[PDB]
């Protein structure tokens, strides 16, 4: 019984660990999109056609 209660508890704890990983990685999903966007602007800025104002 003590092991069974511990194991039933354990899957709950492992669900919490999964949830934290999901929340963190979803946050980095937008971070990756942001970094890819700034790479577009960085590549575009290196063009010689742009003046100083651009």
């Amino acid at each position: 019984t003590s092991q069974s209660r511990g194991l039933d508890m354990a899957v709950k704890n492992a669900n919490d660990g999964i949830s934290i990983a999901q929340t963190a990685e979803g946050a980095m999903n937008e971070t990756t999109n942001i970094l890819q966007r700034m790479r577009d602007l960085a590549l575009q800025s290196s063009n010689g056609s742009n003046s100083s104002s651009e």
Binding site: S46, N47, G48, S49
Partner: protein, 54 residues
């Protein structure tokens, strides 16, 4: 000969105006201020090509 020189001098002033006023969105081209600029045509950094027009 002086009458021809009038046309030659007027056309000489035209060439100077062509170099001074030719621009690409305000960026002068034929006046020598362009110098050399590198156009980025690569998917990674450092893959540019230099254009020079005196």
């Amino acid at each position: 000969r002086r009458a021809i020189q009038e046309e030659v001098s007027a056309l000489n002033d035209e060439l100077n105006r062509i170099a001074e006023t030719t621009s690409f969105g305000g960026n002068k081209l034929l006046n020598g201020s362009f110098g050399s600029k590198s156009f980025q045509i690569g998917a990674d950094s450092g893959e540019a090509v230099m254009l020079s027009m005196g």
